[PDB]
Nucleic acid binder design. Sequence first.
DNA 1: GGCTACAGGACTC
DNA 2: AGGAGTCCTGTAGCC
Length: 343
Amino acid sequence: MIVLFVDFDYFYAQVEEVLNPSLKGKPVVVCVFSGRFEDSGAVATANYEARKFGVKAGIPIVEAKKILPNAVYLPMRKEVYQQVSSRIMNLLREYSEKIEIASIDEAYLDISDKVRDYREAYNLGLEIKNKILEKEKITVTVGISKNKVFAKIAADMAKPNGIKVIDDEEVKRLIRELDIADVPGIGNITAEKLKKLGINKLVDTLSIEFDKLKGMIGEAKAKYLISLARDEYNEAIRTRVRKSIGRIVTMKRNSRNLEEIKPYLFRAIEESYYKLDKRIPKAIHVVAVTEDLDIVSRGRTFPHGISKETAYSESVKLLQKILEEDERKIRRIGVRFSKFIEA
DNA sequence: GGCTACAGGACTC
DNA sequence: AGGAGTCCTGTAGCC
Ligand SMILES: Nc1ccn([C@H]2C[C@H](O)[C@@H](COP(=O)(O)OP(=O)(O)O)O2)c(=O)n1
Ligand SMILES: [Ca+2]
Ligand SMILES: [Ca+2]
Ligand SMILES: [Ca+2]
Ligand SMILES: [Ca+2]
């Protein structure tokens, strides 16, 4: 198989530049303001000019401002970024029937039937980049390889505004040489667990006892890494269908008082139901983030769809369970709906 | 022994 | 010390 992966560069920040070209060449930081106090919140992303100085996704906005007090700080406008995303995805559909939209800024295309070899794949990648630049003035990075995982790795290597093929010989090189932390699905927690076992490369997973590997990282992750290391990985490129919709908000102060929390919970429900738009969930989960940043939840599945009135009443019962079973104060409160009726 | 539903761990964006 | 969404797993009831 020949897989072509597209990952949009500096996406939210790049969109803001397209809509305001005066931002060109300035550091730009897209922010998620929690509303708790002045500049409370985190960075969603930043462009190269800010990121090169350490302003990276997830850091507190106050910390970004200590590093770059004169950068341009913009509130996240996700609805804008989504609309631009959708248009770019529509452009990509023209290059393959076999296409997976993986996230707000990623797609995988199976181009096995559109091209013969990696040379033709590379050239199609150039054509795609040109098209997206022509139509939307957005730069992207293309990764091309034999499966989804190595196509994503290919793009990681070529970012930003790049294009890279990882041929069959380089897959073997990477199995030996790629830091296993840089494999998709391996975060800091798993990477450290693997270091405890002595595993630094994919190849290392082949010689460790399977039960040892599994005991530390679980069966699925073990089999995943081994299949990659064996160069025997397969994962379908296919239509992702949204399985859950939800909203969680930060409260102005921490609280374990039901009547103080209800209004935030009810706003989260209202916004969630708006986003559901015709989709009818059969399951509801209430999610709380405690003052110490632990996430706790309580959910329920019904044998029918959940009306908004039922969501209100059941959400309170689930929050009640959290308050009954946990003595801590709550900082963020929200809901997630799932198990949609197939309409 | 392996379904199911639920609560939490961990990852991606 | 944001916020959205997904997949896996330990546990316990049930067959
Ligand atoms: N922790 C994160 C990571 C990404 N995002 C959003 C903002 C990013 O522009 C897009 C795409 O993620 P990606 O990790 O590829 O980041 P960039 O494209 O480099 O900005 O998703 C976010 O809101 N929070
Ligand atoms: Ca990506
Ligand atoms: Ca990106
Ligand atoms: Ca990693
Ligand atoms: Ca059995």
